[PDB]
Symmetry: D2
Subunit: 371 residues, 4 copies
């Protein structure tokens, strides 16, 4: 096979998560690209070298090295600091170094099986006729593949308009050609639900009981960047979107991977590729964060996501590869920003899509400079 | 007994809800005070007279009559228009006319039993040793008295900080003297949950299985104005709080009765009175409203309610009656507005408590002019 | 000569300004394009019909005829209603009809001479060696051509950073080739100063004493749309910028023509064309408006204008005509939106330039459709 | 006479202003109370110690000694840090220590004469029949007492609605009893104009030519805290108002002394006391700051000041001293906050007056504690 894998993780911690994460990555020979920030102490760099002495191919480029690379690519102001958006640096580096599979992870996620890297390499198997899962409402709930207490939940980024009628939706499985390029692994413990769901029922993912699915064309499901493998061809469309844009005066946050998960998904289906949900599963322990502050950060994006996803189905895309398709998607979002109507579509909400459109083309422009 | 009852309802509808609501009120001889607004058509007034010809003691004062009364009480700018805050006009009128019990209802609530008015008259029974319900965490979940699908929920206004540990709280029932002055009836169908809960699980109240409870001193539970009887002595502390105050730039709404339900509750316990939860139960059908807009309106209040309720337990109150105690509460909230700290306590959030403090004293001042 | 002139005016008034504006336009055979809005009464349409019978070639398309034209050009949402941005409709119509000169006016401006149209036809003279005016600081104060009391003033849109040192700048006149394509006529009575200047000194323009000037390459001066002729080739770059974008939460207004005046000016100098200031002079009487409300709307623009103009001098442009150069300018504004730094450059301020750039391309896309 | 004078200055500088300020204060035996902040370096404390050995009675309480004093007075959250509002600490300290005259100054002001302290002692002369200056429009322009180029200006805080017609107002001088308690010394160089005036004309005060005046009852003029003596009886009404309250989402600043100057002025005239303008004159050199940032902070104040001053003329006050009259003023401001109407009076603008009224009473409550 000779499939190369690079794991991208951004962090501002001391690096203690490497003690449990390294054995799963060192046995498979995959590279771990750790992207620190300006608010990251020197304990992380000392923890990376010690794990490298144990055999782990871990790279931790300092802030000066990251900024020097971004300035050499004419994008010095694209990726901000004091933000998890810096994982785009790891996406770029892993793509420059020619890795076949790029696995995006959070520093608080831990693999639960010994074949974590092997299962994520499913995005490099190629096209073949395989069981594909379709839904009559065009949406699939990946949380239905898990055993969740005390009630059924939806993943973060799932549109709220389609939730009440999703119970009556018909799910079909058919043998059809498909080419998996994005594999979204599931999570045990604290699932990836929005702040609205975590505040209401505080869900707990007990086990992974539904297996794995490959979504057919027209059936969507949000993809995060906490346990997701992306084939190197689809990485140009996996740019982690810049947050902070105000919606009716409230700065938007915590949805950078919601847009990127949908953007790489609509580009993949335009090119005849599919998204996979299921294994490998990680353990996401419950972190102690102000859930009311998470809600305050997620509401601005939630008010717009339903309309954005609705117009993306009506808008056809152009392109022969992910670079051309992602740039065609950026201009599509600018037409949507002026066509959409609603109470939450203030001038700053519309301009959010326009600024995001420029940053996405600035991302693709940087990838075209190295290539 | 000779107990007089007045039902206060504000509406902007055509008055079609009177066809089913009048029989429950006409048989008991209670008065129905309907408060229209400027955005209310002339069909409501024609529907009130026809139901009055059938025997219902229904009063529907026009906007000109309401404003003339408020200007005669030196409060012309207290109650705004195009808002459900106009139910304060019904509170004032029912209190001026000397009614013993004032039942606050929404126009979309319908009694389910033939003893609706009789059960709400429990607030005029007087003090007596009776089973009182206490909780080790100081909070009672009235939704636990209902059969709810698909999972357990909390009422709108219940603090989020105490929800995770509320399952391990110990509930006790003891024989203690108590004087019920506020009776919060429950609701079937769509329960009174916040927008966070309704978006996540979309609860459905099937039946009322837990009976009725009287909360002891120190055990709180939010009280709404959709199906709640208030003894005429406690009405001065039941002022429906003015909404629209921005919190970090976002106008607050949909929590006018959350503050009033807590304010009349903390005043009642200071004076040795209690709040009752249970019967009579009404049917609240599910209305078709933008749940994401409700969330946008409720988040500003939700970010502050936990801290406000926390400081109210530390702040002692003064007063011999509800007028003195409510005014003492207003000054207490101004001290809290400067002592509280947090990320959501911007200058406009603190000033919200100060403006609310003036409006509450303006409400008590109006009641002292008629009295 | 056989020069066709079209005057573009948008208004919501009754049309009384036609009585004093028609004689100067009817004696010259020019067309007046009146663009009404939704808040325009039916008395304006009757005013245009009477002056039509008096010999004035005046057209007044209803809002239904405006939206029909804008929809056929795939720009139904470009131009908003209840806004003076609707003068773009007159710009478009006059450009489709093939008029050589387009004179942009406000409805409260009145010509003071008989040769009003003849003087504005200077934009159709062609290139010739003529005295051009240059300034050592790169800025020219057109209000210095007027007699203003009680003190010297700068026009609306003049950068504030260059004002204190402008008195020390040297003004030189040289014989150089120039092609006048924009002619900004001056104004007596209430000059076109910003709300800051009008609140401080309330200037009064008494006379036009400085004659007329043609600015050399590198010397700029703001151009408004109240008394300005534009050659039809330069009209594609004269799109009246859409207002309402928030800057730190404050929506901007009253500066749509400030950007359009600078945008058509930087495009003209790139193509070797020049801007003229001086005659014909109009009379702008002191209007009736709250100056503090004008200030509240102009401050968000003023906070960004100096930085935008500074970066436009460094950013080179491309293009062979005004359509290509304007589109090149739009992409230049998006790069400036990410390189600029300052306390006023919040995320919404940067996104303002990105949304404006899309609307500029939407304007050029509509012109390329009729072409 | 045996008149004790205390000069109050808050600063974050190194203390170099002490070299040119001490001689005028040391030769008069006055005390200088320097109030540092958290962002004040250790070089200031060494500067006060050297001038202490040179004979200057200068005190410089550390932020630990400030918070200890403010906590014992039950006002630990009244005065914020990183703000020039900390000059209230100097007002409090000088009042506790029993000084007769309190001179409020900024650290960038320098006396121009030897009798600086002696002239400020005019607030301790007592009542006497003296020439008082009245104006037919109820406003006096103290900048008319100075020689200002290039044109006439109004002081910061002067209402904008009264400026255009002020030139037509009649100024009369009459022999009437008056008791000067506030003396606002004038300023040369950069006068105390608002950011609107400084941006438009950049005034320069060349000389003090108009002498000094004492304003009659009904004639007002804004008083700042940069060069102003306050009799100790009037200090309770001279509380420097806390800034930062949003007006339509924009936080206000730079107007803390504008309100305090008007508040102590309306309280003084209610008690039969007068305000004086003129000598002693200081030199305020042109500072180094972004004028557009000053404008951004002053506009929210300017939008409300005219309406606040208009209602203060109609609202009568009560009280026998400055403590009672200031508290009566605070409740008067809350009634104005609900009666006032206008486009700038959003809910947060009204709540600004309510929170300010509580802080005013918190200030008076602390003074009644030490008393
Ligand atoms: N570069 C960078 N990464 C961050 C920062 N904050 C968080 N992250 C990363 O973003 C991911 C999400 O973190 P967070 O939202 O705090 O997770 P939580 O603790 O479960 O709430 C984590 O895996 C972090 O490694 C930051 O300031 N800079
Ligand atoms: N006076 C007045 N009352 C209102 C207005 N809007 C709603 N209400 C009342 O407030 C209550 C709450 O209404 P609403 O929030 O719309 O209930 P929903 O339909 O279930 O969402 C209703 O019983 C209405 O009678 C209004 O504009 N003016
Ligand atoms: N279509 C349209 N035009 C407007 C509107 N308001 C103003 N205008 C036009 O825009 C120009 C500017 O007017 P205005 O803003 O009132 O200038 P002012 O004198 O400074 O107040 C006028 O000539 C009006 O004809 C509007 O709501 N719609
Ligand atoms: N305690 C404190 N005082 C300040 C601070 N900033 C300014 N001051 C004082 O407030 C006065 C006003 O200064 P400033 O706002 O810079 O005036 P400017 O010349 O118009 O810029 C000065 O005399 C300073 O000593 C601060 O952060 N803390």
């Amino acid at each position: 096979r000779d499939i190369s894998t690079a794991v991208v993780v951004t962090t501002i911690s001391d690096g203690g998560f490497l003690d449990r994460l390294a054995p799963a990555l060192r046995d498979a020979g995959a590279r771990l690209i750790v992207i620190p920030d300006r608010n990251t102490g020197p304990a992380l760099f000392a923890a990376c070298e010690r794990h490298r002495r144990l055999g782990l191919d871990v790279v931790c480029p300092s802030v000066a090295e990251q900024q020097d690379l971004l300035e050499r690519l004419a994008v010095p102001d694209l990726i901000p600091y004091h933000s998890d958006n810096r994982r785009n640096v790891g996406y770029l580096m892993a793509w420059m170094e020619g890795f076949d599979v790029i696995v995006s992870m959070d520093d608080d996620n831990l693999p639960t099986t010994d074949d974590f890297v092997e299962r994520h390499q499913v995005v490099c198997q190629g096209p073949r006729t395989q069981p594909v899962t379709a839904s009559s409402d065009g949406w699939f709930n990946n949380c239905a593949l898990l055993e969740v207490e005390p009630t059924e939940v939806f993943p973060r980024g799932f549109p709220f308009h389609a939730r009440p009628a999703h119970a009556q939706a018909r799910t079909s499985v058919c043998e059809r050609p498909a080419d998996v390029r994005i594999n979204a692994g599931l999570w045990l413990g604290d699932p990836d639900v929005d702040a609205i769901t975590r505040l209401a029922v505080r869900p707990n993912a007990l086990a992974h009981s539904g297996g794995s699915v490959v979504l057919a064309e027209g059936t969507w499901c949000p993809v995060n960047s906490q346990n997701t493998a992306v084939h190197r061809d689809a990485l140009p469309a996996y740019y982690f979107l810049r947050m902070g844009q105000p919606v009716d005066g409230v700065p938007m946050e915590r949805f950078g991977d919601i847009f990127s998960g949908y953007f790489v998904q609509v580009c993949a289906q335009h090119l005849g590729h599919a998204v996979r949900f299921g294994d490998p599963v990680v353990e996401h322990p419950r972190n102690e964060h102000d859930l009311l502050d998470d809600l305050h950060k997620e509401v601005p994006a939630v008010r717009l996501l339903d309309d954005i996803l609705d117009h993306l189905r009506d808008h056809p895309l152009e392109g022969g590869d992910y670079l051309e398709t992602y740039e065609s998607l950026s201009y599509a979002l600018q037409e949507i920003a002026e066509r959409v109507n609603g109470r939450a579509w203030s001038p700053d909400a519309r301009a959010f899509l326009h600024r995001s459109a420029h940053l996405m083309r600035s991302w693709t422009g940087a990838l075209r400079t190295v290539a």
